[PDB]
Amino acid sequence: MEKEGFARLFHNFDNVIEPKLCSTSGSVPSYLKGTMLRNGPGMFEIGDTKYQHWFDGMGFIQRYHFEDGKMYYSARYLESENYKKNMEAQRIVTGSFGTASFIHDNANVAFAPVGDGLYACTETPNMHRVDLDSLDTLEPVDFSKYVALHTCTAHQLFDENGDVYNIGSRFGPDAAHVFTVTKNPKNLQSDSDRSWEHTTKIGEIRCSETFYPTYMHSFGMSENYLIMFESPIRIDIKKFIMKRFITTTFRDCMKWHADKDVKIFILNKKTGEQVPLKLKMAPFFTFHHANTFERDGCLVVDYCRIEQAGNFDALLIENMKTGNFQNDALFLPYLTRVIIPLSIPDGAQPGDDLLKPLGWAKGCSAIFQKIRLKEKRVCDISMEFPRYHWEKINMKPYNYVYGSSVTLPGIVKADLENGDHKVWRRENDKQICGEPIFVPNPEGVREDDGILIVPVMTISDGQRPFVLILEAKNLTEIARYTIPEARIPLGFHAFYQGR
Ligand SMILES: [Fe+3]
Numbered sequence: 001m002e003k004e005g006f007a008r009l010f011h012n013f014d015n016v017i018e019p020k021l022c023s024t025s026g027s028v029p030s031y032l033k034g035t036m037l038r039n040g041p042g043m044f045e046i047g048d049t050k051y052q053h054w055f056d057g058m059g060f061i062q063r064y065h066f067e068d069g070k071m072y073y074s075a076r077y078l079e080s081e082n083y084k085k086n087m088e089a090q091r092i093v094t095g096s097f098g099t100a101s102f103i104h105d106n107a108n109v110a111f112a113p114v115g116d117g118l119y120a121c122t123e124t125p126n127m128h129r130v131d132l133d134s135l136d137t138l139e140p141v142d143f144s145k146y147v148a149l150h151t152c153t154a155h156q157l158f159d160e161n162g163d164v165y166n167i168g169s170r171f172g173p174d175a176a177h178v179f180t181v182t183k184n185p186k187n188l189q190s191d192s193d194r195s196w197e198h199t200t201k202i203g204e205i206r207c208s209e210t211f212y213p214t215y216m217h218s219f220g221m222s223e224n225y226l227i228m229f230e231s232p233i234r235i236d237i238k239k240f241i242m243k244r245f246i247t248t249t250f251r252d253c254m255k256w257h258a259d260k261d262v263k264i265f266i267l268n269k270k271t272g273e274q275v276p277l278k279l280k281m282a283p284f285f286t287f288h289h290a291n292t293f294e295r296d297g298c299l300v301v302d303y304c305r306i307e308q309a310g311n312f313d314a315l316l317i318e319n320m321k322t323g324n325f326q327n328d329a330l331f332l333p334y335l336t337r338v339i340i341p342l343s344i345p346d347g348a349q350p351g352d353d354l355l356k357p358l359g360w361a362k363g364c365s366a367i368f369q370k371i372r373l374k375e376k377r378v379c380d381i382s383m384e385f386p387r388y389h390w391e392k393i394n395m396k397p398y399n400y401v402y403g404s405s406v407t408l409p410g411i412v413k414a415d416l417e418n419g420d421h422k423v424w425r426r427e428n429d430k431q432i433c434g435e436p437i438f439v440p441n442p443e444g445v446r447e448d449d450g451i452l453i454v455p456v457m458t459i460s461d462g463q464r465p466f467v468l469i470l471e472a473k474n475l476t477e478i479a480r481y482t483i484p485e486a487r488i489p490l491g492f493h494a495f496y497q498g499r
């Protein structure tokens with residue numbers, strides 16, 4: 001293992017079974033009491049075989065437990081069927097996003113709450129419940145038992161009732177994006193308070209090109225609508241169905257179709273009917289939607305926009321190892337807003353900007369041609385892993401998005417109202433900020449009355465990783481928990497459970 005560099009983070013991680021008391025500085029308010037689980041890849045080589053892509057590594061879940069003003073750290077591999085088969089063979093024997101083999105249930109991306117249960121997910125129907133304390137891998141769940149689909153996002157969205165929504169893709173001559181709702185099992189007669197049994201298909205929207213469905217990482221949800229982009233990154237289905245004959249991967253069947261505009265698909269959550277508009281915009285890709293809401297007959301969709309991503313060559317392990325392959329400015333994400341009229345007024349003329357009357361929409365336009373949408377950048381400081389104050393303004397007009405940078409910007413708070421953005425600056429270039437999680441003050445009234453939990457990775461053996469606690473109004477540090485391990489993973493998403 002190197003003393004310095006991103007290569008440090010691609011050596012295999014070891015389990016940390018007994019929760020380790022971390023070193024405290026500062027102090028936290030009484031309402032920081034709960035457990036954050038963080039998902040991501042931890043194992044990048046097995047025996048004589050190595051994974052190719054960042055997204056491939058075996059899921060390695062960390063637990064950051066907050067109690068009595070202290071933090072405790074532990075971490076364990078998800079014991080998926082893939083993990084267990086690979087560990088027994090001592091080689092990479094099951095496929096992954098970007099590596100061919102030498103059931104896809106390596107749920108290394110994020111977590112979905114259903115009732116009182118927490119389910120580790122990847123972009124397949126095959127999930128596992130995980131215990132928030134012991135990090136045991138519990139029962140498997142096959143989401144496709146309830147709705148026929150081949151892939152689905154690991155970014156399920158939920159509402160105040162705890163109902164969980166997702167979009168998946170069903171391949172075939174019929175190819176379609178299927179929109180789903182899973183009713184909270186606590187509010188109905190169910191097998192258990194964590195059962196996925198109340199899952200139905202709301203509706204579906206056919207892919208424009210049956211043999212080139214879009215790749216999709218996330219989507220937006222408002223009070224009445226689910227919205228997705230048909231991105232230029234397309235899965236070559238004919239190539240993919242042959243994968244076991246030509247030794248290829250899912251990622252290698254994806255390409256960015258450079259001559260295609262983006263289409264917007266919108267489904268009414270409650271009617272199940274597609275919004276009957278043809279909506280186009282200039283090409284882009286987004287990993288992560290932020291919040292989504294309705295205002296003045298329009299759907300407002302915020303997201304971190306990437307100009308050009310190919311099929312994610314930039315996130316191959318070899319490319320990230322060097323770190324230097326971060327001078328890819330077309331891959332830098334920016335928080336962006338598009339505003340979509342949900343209807344066209346009688347008498348609209350070609351060239352009319354349907355958003356011109358709406359002063360709050362200035363900077364976006366929606367030109368009647370079909371409607372061509374023009375988005376606007378809402379934060380000039382590049383950011384990714386967006387999060388917001390879900391409890392107060394999910395599906396509602398809102399002011400703030402928190403994200404991570406990827407001089408020395410670390411965490412960014414975008415101000416959608418006035419543009420008074422805030423930044424917590426990293427202390428040196430051996431630090432990397434992870435996804436910030438907003439925890440609300442129970443007695444707060446403003447949208448940013450709360451704190452942020454920020455895991456900070458390091459790429460140097462002279463600096464231990466830590467969890468940073470920021471107050472959310474001005475992003476100043478109020479506490480820091482330094483972890484007695486050499487590394488935490490270059491990970492993906494976290495889930496915080498107050499308790
Ligand atoms: Fe993600």
